[PDB]
Nucleic acid binder design. Structure first.
Ligand SMILES: [Cl-]
Lengths: 120, 120
DNA sequence: TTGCTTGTTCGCGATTGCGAACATATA
DNA sequence: ATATATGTTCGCAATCGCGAACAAGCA
């Protein structure tokens, strides 16, 4: 199963998690931005650990969506926080980083586009 | 109803549809990129027609997602096409533009991250 | 043994977000 | 009558994606 991530699959999961190339290269791949661009362009294969961390971030996203679903089924119309600046996010989440900020942006954007939540 | 879209809501739906600021400003707002950045930063209100066009694009996304859901319920593991370059997408879709390209990118990324489709 | 692999670094053109200024049309 | 909202253009620092070159680590 692991190790079959294509370059375009990596680009797609990165874009869906709403990560910039530099952010993922610095915090996930722990490599230069050029190496991440090479991975997404097909020059070098996607490392196994990078792929596994992608799936892990996907699972974290699933947890967030599940909490919001719990709130929805209870009759709530959620007012979800969509942090424009990363510093505003880290002021409310000291043990997080830009990865969690982008994940929160993605979940809030999805639940607004679906029409179930308003963003503040 | 129309006119309640905030700046952050516009930014969120734009990023969800995987649109760049320049693309949305050129093809959707039909304004300069500076005016779109002003809209998304809260300098001026989001026009009603731009809002409604956002919602219409969301509906088109729902159409695509429903087609792929039908394919999934039939037992198929979809091999979704993720176009890295816009010219490839337009060569496969003559009557489309960058909006449909970004919509298809977002949908394919969603169905790959969910774990139901492979990208080619 | 060294070709394929993979990473870093540098340079450069293209692109972006934003401040600032200008213009308009309209209440 | 006129502030005010809203669009445009211009310049600029910052950022990004890419080509090309260099280097280490192999198998
Ligand atoms: Cl409701």
């Amino acid at each position: 199963p692991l190790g079959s991530m294509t370059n375009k699959e990596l680009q797609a999961i990165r874009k869906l998690l709403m990560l910039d190339v530099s952010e993922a290269a610095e915090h996930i791949g722990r490599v230069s931005a050029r190496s991440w661009q090479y991975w997404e362009s097909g020059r070098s294969a996607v490392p196994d650990d990078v792929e596994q961390e992608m799936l892990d971030l996907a699972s974290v996203r699933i947890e967030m969506m599940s909490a919001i679903d719990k709130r929805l089924a209870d009759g709530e119309r959620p007012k979800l926080r969509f942090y424009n600046k990363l510093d505003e996010y880290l002021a409310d989440n000291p043990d997080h980083n830009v990865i969690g900020w982008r994940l929160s942006q993605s979940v809030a954007a999805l639940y607004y586009t679906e029409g179930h939540a308003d963003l503040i």
